[PDB]
DNA sequence: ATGAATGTGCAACAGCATGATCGCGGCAACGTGCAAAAGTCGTGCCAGC
RNA sequence: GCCGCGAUC
DNA sequence: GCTGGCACGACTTTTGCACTCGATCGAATGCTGTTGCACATTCAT
C-alpha cells in the first residue's frame, strides 16, 4: 500500500541513511480487484467470494484492526465517520498512551 | 456463592480480530465433549440423546 | 440494540420505561453466530483484546 | 416450449472474436436424449452427445 | 421549538460536535440534577439544550468548567 | 464440540480452490494431488537409497514393480494419512533460502512469478507461526446445536 | 399413478392459484401461455431475443 | 399501561400527543438510491390510515403516488434523536450531495 | 541443420448479475439375548373413623 | 425453515 | 367393628451393549478473470 511506502520512505529518510528509501512504481487497479486487496479481511469478505479471501486470510494469520466503516458496522461499534468520529478520536489516543 | 452475573459480564473489550488456522488440540478445547451417535432425537421419550 | 443484542433489548426497554434514553449498547448476536460458524469450520477466529 | 426438431444456429458468429461465424446444429427429441453438431474455427466437426 | 439548528450550529461550527454537546446537555437535563438555563416552552430537552446552545449560553468549554466547579464542591 | 474421524480427511477450502494452497505448497499440480487424494495413485516419501524421487507419483502396477523389485526402503500411502507424512517431514526455513538462492542466482520471467508466489506463501506460513500440517483436519468440530 | 397425477396436479410449476377478482382475470389466466415450467426456460435464462 | 393501552382509552390518545410533540421520525423508501433518501421529518398525527408525505420531497425520495410505500423508523436516543435533527431533518439538507 | 528453452495463444474452470413489500399452496430420514438394574403387581400390614 | 407461483413500486 | 393408605416377594420391563450383515435427469444466461497445456519461434552448438 502507497500509505505504508510514504510513512517508511518519510521515516527512512528522517534518520541519517536517507539512500535506505526505495523508489516505487504506482499501479492502478478495478473497483472489483482493488476492493479485494484491502489489508483488513473483515471488510472484501463481505463484498465478494468468502471462500478465497478466508483462506488468504487464514494461512496468512492476519488481523482487521477494524480500521473502516464496513469493519464497525458488521461489529455494531460506532463508526469512524461523523458523530462517531470524535468517539474514536478519544480512543485512539488511549491505546497509544497505553 | 450466589450473586453472580455472567450475562452482563459476557460483553468484554475486544479489538483487532484475529483470525488464523486451527489446530487439533485448539479444536478439543474448544469442545467440551464428544459425538457418536447418529441421531438426534429419540421419539420414545421426546429427549435429547446421549 | 433493535436487532440482536439480546441484553441490549431488554436493557433499553427498561431504560425507555424509566424515561432514561441511554444507549448501553452491546455486542450483536449475529456475530457470534457467525463466528462459530466459521469455528465450525478449521479456521479459528478469536477477539483480541 | 420448444417444438422437437432440427434447429440449425449460427451462435451469432462471436464467440472466437476472429470473425468466423460458427453454423450449430441441434436434435431436440420430445423425450430422450440431445444430439448436437457443432463446427470449430478449425472447421472441424464436433458432435456433443448429451 | 427549532426547525433549523443553522443558528446552533453556526455558534460551534462543526454540524458533528453539536450533536454531541446538545446530547450531554440534553442528558444533564433528562436524567436529573440539572435545570434549563433558558425558558422552557413546553418542548422537549433536545430542542432545549439545541436553543440553549444557539443563544450561546451552553458549550463545550463552559460544560466543562461546569462539571470541574461541581466536582470541586463535591 | 467435536468429531475424530479415525482417518485424516483433506479440507476443501485449502484443496479445491484456484489458488490452491497445497496445490502450489508441494510444486505439485491440482490434478495430481485430487489423484492421490481418492487412492487411484501412490505417492512415495524418503527412498533415499532406492531409485524412487522424494515426490513421486508412481502409480498402483508401479506400486508393485517396486516392492518386487526394490522391497524394503520404498515408503508409500494411498490416503491422505500420506500428504500429512510429507508435510511433516518438509523444513519450511531450509526450503525458503534454497528457493530464495534458485530465484535470484536464475533469472527468468516464467519461474519467478511461481517463485515468488511459493517464497511468499513459505514466508506468510514461518511468521505467522503455523504449521503446514493443519490444512487436513483429523478432529472435524460442529455447530452449536441451537444454531 | 395417484401419486405422480396427484403431484403435477397439486405442485408444479405451471398449476398456480386461480385469480377470482372479476370474471376477467379467471378468463385471462385461464387462456394463459407460459414459457416457463419443467421443459421450459429459466427466468434468468431469457435472453432479450426471447 | 398495558391494559389500558391495548383498551385505548382518551387519556391514551393525548399522552401519546404528549409523547409525539419533537420526537423526529426517519422515514425511507425502499430503493434507497443516495443519501436523500432516507429524511427525518416531524410527525404530526392523522386521523387517517397512509403516511401523507411533503410534495417538495417527492423529487429527493423519487416517489410519485401511486401506490408507493415508505418505512418508518423510530430514532429512540437522545444522540439518535438529535442526529435526526441536526443531520437528517429535511430543511437541513436542501442542495443535493452530488 | 537440429535440439531446447521460451513466449504466446487457446481451452476449461470459477464467481457473479438491484432493493423493499404483499398474497396462496407443499414440503424426511434396524436387531439381540442376557445380566443388571429398575419398575410393577398381587399380596399382606397398621392407623383413623 | 424454505420452495415454487402471482402481484406492487 | 368398619375402612383406607403403606411395604414385601415374585413378575415384568428396560437398557447397556457393542456386534454384526446389509434410472432419470436437465441440459439452453453472458461476462469476465484465472490457470494450465500445447505449439510456434528463436537461439545455441
Ligand atoms: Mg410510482
Redesign the interface.
Not at chain 1, 471462500?51 to 455494531?76: M, P, S, Y
Not at chain 5, 439544550?49 to 466547579?69: F, H, K, T
Not at chain 7, 421443459?39 to 435464462?45: I, N
Not at chain 8, 421520525?25 to 387517517?48: C, D, K, M, S, W
Given at each position: 500500500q502507497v500509505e505504508y511506502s510514504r510513512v517508511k520512505i518519510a521515516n527512512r529518510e528522517l534518520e541519517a541513511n536517507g539512500k535506505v528509501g526505495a523508489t516505487y512504481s504506482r499501479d492502478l487497479l478495478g473497483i472489483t480487484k482493488a476492493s479485494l486487496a484491502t489489508e483488513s479481511?473483515?471488510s472484501a469478505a463481505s463484498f465478494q467470494e468468502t471462500?478465497?479471501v478466508?483462506?488468504?486470510?487464514?494461512?496468512?494469520?492476519?488481523?482487521?484492526?477494524?480500521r473502516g466503516l464496513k469493519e464497525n458496522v458488521?461489529?455494531?461499534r460506532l463508526i469512524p465517520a461523523?458523530?462517531g468520529?470524535?468517539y474514536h478520536q478519544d480512543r485512539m489516543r488511549r491505546?497509544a498512551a497505553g | 456463592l450466589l450473586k453472580f452475573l455472567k450475562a452482563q459480564t459476557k460483553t468484554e473489550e475486544f479489538?483487532?480480530?484475529?483470525?488464523?488456522?486451527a489446530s487439533p488440540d485448539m479444536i478439543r478445547s474448544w469442545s467440551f465433549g464428544e459425538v457418536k451417535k447418529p441421531e438426534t432425537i429419540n421419539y420414545r421419550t421426546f429427549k435429547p440423546e446421549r | 440494540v433493535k436487532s440482536?443484542?439480546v441484553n441490549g433489548r431488554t436493557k433499553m426497554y427498561k431504560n425507555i420505561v424509566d424515561g432514561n434514553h441511554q444507549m448501553e449498547?452491546?455486542?450483536?448476536e449475529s456475530?457470534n453466530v457467525l463466528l462459530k460458524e466459521?469455528r465450525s469450520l478449521?479456521?479459528n477466529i478469536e477477539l483480541?483484546d | 416450449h420448444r417444438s422437437p426438431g432440427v434447429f440449425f444456429d449460427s451462435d451469432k458468429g462471436k464467440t472466437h472474436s476472429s470473425g468466423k461465424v460458427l453454423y450449430n446444429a441441434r436434435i431436440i427429441p420430445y423425450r430422450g436424449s440431445w444430439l448436437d453438431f457443432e463446427f470449430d474455427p478449425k472447421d472441424n466437426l464436433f458432435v456433443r452427445i448429451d | 421549538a427549532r426547525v433549523t439548528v443553522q443558528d446552533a450550529v453556526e455558534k460551534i461550527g462543526n454540524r458533528?460536535?453539536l450533536?454531541?454537546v446538545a446530547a450531554r446537555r440534553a442528558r444533564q437535563m433528562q436524567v436529573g440534577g440539572k435545570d434549563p438555563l433558558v425558558p422552557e416552552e413546553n418542548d422537549k430537552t433536545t430542542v432545549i439544550a439545541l436553543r440553549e446552545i444557539e443563544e450561546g449560553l451552553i458549550n463545550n468549554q463552559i460544560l466543562d468548567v461546569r462539571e470541574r466547579q461541581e466536582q470541586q464542591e463535591q | 464440540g467435536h468429531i475424530e474421524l479415525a482417518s485424516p480427511t483433506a479440507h476443501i477450502?485449502?484443496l479445491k480452490?484456484?489458488?490452491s494452497?497445497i496445490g502450489l505448497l508441494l510444486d505439485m499440480p491440482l490434478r495430481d494431488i485430487e489423484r492421490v487424494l481418492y487412492f487411484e495413485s501412490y505417492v512415495v516419501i524418503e527412498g533415499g537409497m532406492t531409485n524412487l524421487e522424494r515426490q513421486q507419483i508412481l502409480t498402483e502396477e508401479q506400486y508393485l514393480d517396486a516392492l518386487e523389485e526394490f522391497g524394503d526402503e520404498f515408503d508409500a500411502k494411498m490416503g491422505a494419512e500420506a500428504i500429512q507424512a510429507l508435510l511433516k517431514s518438509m523444513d519450511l526455513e531450509q526450503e525458503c533460502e534454497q528457493l530464495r538462492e534458485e530465484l535470484n542466482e536464475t533469472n527468468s520471467e516464467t519461474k519467478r512469478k511461481k517463485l515468488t508466489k511459493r517464497i511468499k506463501?513459505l514466508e506468510?506460513?514461518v511468521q505467522?507461526?503455523?504449521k503446514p500440517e493443519w490444512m487436513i483436519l483429523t478432529v472435524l468440530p460442529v455447530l452449536p446445536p441451537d444454531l | 399413478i395417484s401419486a405422480a397425477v396427484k403431484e403435477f396436479f397439486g405442485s408444479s410449476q405451471l398449476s398456480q392459484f386461480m385469480d377470482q377478482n372479476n370474471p376477467l382475470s379467471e378468463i385471462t389466466h385461464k387462456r394463459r401461455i407460459s414459457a416457463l415450467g419443467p421443459g421450459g426456460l429459466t427466468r434468468e435464462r431469457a435472453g432479450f431475443e426471447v | 399501561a398495558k391494559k389500558m393501552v391495548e383498551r385505548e382509552e382518551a387519556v391514551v390518545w393525548d399522552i401519546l400527543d404528549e409523547v409525539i410533540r419533537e420526537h423526529p421520525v426517519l422515514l425511507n423508501r425502499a430503493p434507497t438510491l443516495h443519501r436523500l433518501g432516507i429524511q427525518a421529518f416531524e410527525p404530526v398525527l392523522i386521523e387517517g390510515k397512509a403516511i401523507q408525505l411533503h410534495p417538495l420531497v417527492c423529487a429527493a425520495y423519487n416517489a410519485d403516488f401511486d401506490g408507493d410505500q415508505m418505512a418508518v423508523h423510530v430514532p429512540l436516543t437522545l444522540?439518535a434523536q438529535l442526529?435526526a435533527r441536526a443531520?437528517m431533518m429535511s430543511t437541513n439538507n436542501i442542495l443535493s450531495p452530488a
Amino acid at each position: 500500500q502507497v500509505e505504508y511506502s510514504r510513512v517508511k520512505i518519510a521515516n527512512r529518510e528522517l534518520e541519517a541513511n536517507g539512500k535506505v528509501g526505495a523508489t516505487y512504481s504506482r499501479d492502478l487497479l478495478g473497483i472489483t480487484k482493488a476492493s479485494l486487496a484491502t489489508e483488513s479481511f473483515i471488510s472484501a469478505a463481505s463484498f465478494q467470494e468468502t471462500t478465497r479471501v478466508l483462506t488468504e486470510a487464514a494461512v496468512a494469520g492476519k488481523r482487521d484492526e477494524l480500521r473502516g466503516l464496513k469493519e464497525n458496522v458488521i461489529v455494531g461499534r460506532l463508526i469512524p465517520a461523523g458523530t462517531g468520529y470524535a468517539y474514536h478520536q478519544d480512543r485512539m489516543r488511549r491505546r497509544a498512551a497505553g | 456463592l450466589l450473586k453472580f452475573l455472567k450475562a452482563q459480564t459476557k460483553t468484554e473489550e475486544f479489538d483487532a480480530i484475529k483470525i488464523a488456522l486451527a489446530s487439533p488440540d485448539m479444536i478439543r478445547s474448544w469442545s467440551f465433549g464428544e459425538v457418536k451417535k447418529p441421531e438426534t432425537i429419540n421419539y420414545r421419550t421426546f429427549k435429547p440423546e446421549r | 440494540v433493535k436487532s440482536d443484542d439480546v441484553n441490549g433489548r431488554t436493557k433499553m426497554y427498561k431504560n425507555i420505561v424509566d424515561g432514561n434514553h441511554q444507549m448501553e449498547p452491546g455486542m450483536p448476536e449475529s456475530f457470534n453466530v457467525l463466528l462459530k460458524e466459521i469455528r465450525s469450520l478449521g479456521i479459528n477466529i478469536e477477539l483480541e483484546d | 416450449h420448444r417444438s422437437p426438431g432440427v434447429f440449425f444456429d449460427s451462435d451469432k458468429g462471436k464467440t472466437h472474436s476472429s470473425g468466423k461465424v460458427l453454423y450449430n446444429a441441434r436434435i431436440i427429441p420430445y423425450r430422450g436424449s440431445w444430439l448436437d453438431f457443432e463446427f470449430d474455427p478449425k472447421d472441424n466437426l464436433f458432435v456433443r452427445i448429451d | 421549538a427549532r426547525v433549523t439548528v443553522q443558528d446552533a450550529v453556526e455558534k460551534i461550527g462543526n454540524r458533528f460536535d453539536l450533536v454531541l454537546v446538545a446530547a450531554r446537555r440534553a442528558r444533564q437535563m433528562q436524567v436529573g440534577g440539572k435545570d434549563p438555563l433558558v425558558p422552557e416552552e413546553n418542548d422537549k430537552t433536545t430542542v432545549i439544550a439545541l436553543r440553549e446552545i444557539e443563544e450561546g449560553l451552553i458549550n463545550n468549554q463552559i460544560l466543562d468548567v461546569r462539571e470541574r466547579q461541581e466536582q470541586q464542591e463535591q | 464440540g467435536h468429531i475424530e474421524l479415525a482417518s485424516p480427511t483433506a479440507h476443501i477450502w485449502f484443496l479445491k480452490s484456484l489458488p490452491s494452497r497445497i496445490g502450489l505448497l508441494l510444486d505439485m499440480p491440482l490434478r495430481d494431488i485430487e489423484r492421490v487424494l481418492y487412492f487411484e495413485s501412490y505417492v512415495v516419501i524418503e527412498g533415499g537409497m532406492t531409485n524412487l524421487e522424494r515426490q513421486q507419483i508412481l502409480t498402483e502396477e508401479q506400486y508393485l514393480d517396486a516392492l518386487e523389485e526394490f522391497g524394503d526402503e520404498f515408503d508409500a500411502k494411498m490416503g491422505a494419512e500420506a500428504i500429512q507424512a510429507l508435510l511433516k517431514s518438509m523444513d519450511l526455513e531450509q526450503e525458503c533460502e534454497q528457493l530464495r538462492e534458485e530465484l535470484n542466482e536464475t533469472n527468468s520471467e516464467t519461474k519467478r512469478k511461481k517463485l515468488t508466489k511459493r517464497i511468499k506463501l513459505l514466508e506468510a506460513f514461518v511468521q505467522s507461526g503455523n504449521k503446514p500440517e493443519w490444512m487436513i483436519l483429523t478432529v472435524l468440530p460442529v455447530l452449536p446445536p441451537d444454531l | 399413478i395417484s401419486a405422480a397425477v396427484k403431484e403435477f396436479f397439486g405442485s408444479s410449476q405451471l398449476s398456480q392459484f386461480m385469480d377470482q377478482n372479476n370474471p376477467l382475470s379467471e378468463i385471462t389466466h385461464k387462456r394463459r401461455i407460459s414459457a416457463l415450467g419443467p421443459g421450459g426456460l429459466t427466468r434468468e435464462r431469457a435472453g432479450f431475443e426471447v | 399501561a398495558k391494559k389500558m393501552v391495548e383498551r385505548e382509552e382518551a387519556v391514551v390518545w393525548d399522552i401519546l400527543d404528549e409523547v409525539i410533540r419533537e420526537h423526529p421520525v426517519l422515514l425511507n423508501r425502499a430503493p434507497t438510491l443516495h443519501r436523500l433518501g432516507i429524511q427525518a421529518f416531524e410527525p404530526v398525527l392523522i386521523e387517517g390510515k397512509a403516511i401523507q408525505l411533503h410534495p417538495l420531497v417527492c423529487a429527493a425520495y423519487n416517489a410519485d403516488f401511486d401506490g408507493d410505500q415508505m418505512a418508518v423508523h423510530v430514532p429512540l436516543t437522545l444522540e439518535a434523536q438529535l442526529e435526526a435533527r441536526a443531520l437528517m431533518m429535511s430543511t437541513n439538507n436542501i442542495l443535493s450531495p452530488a
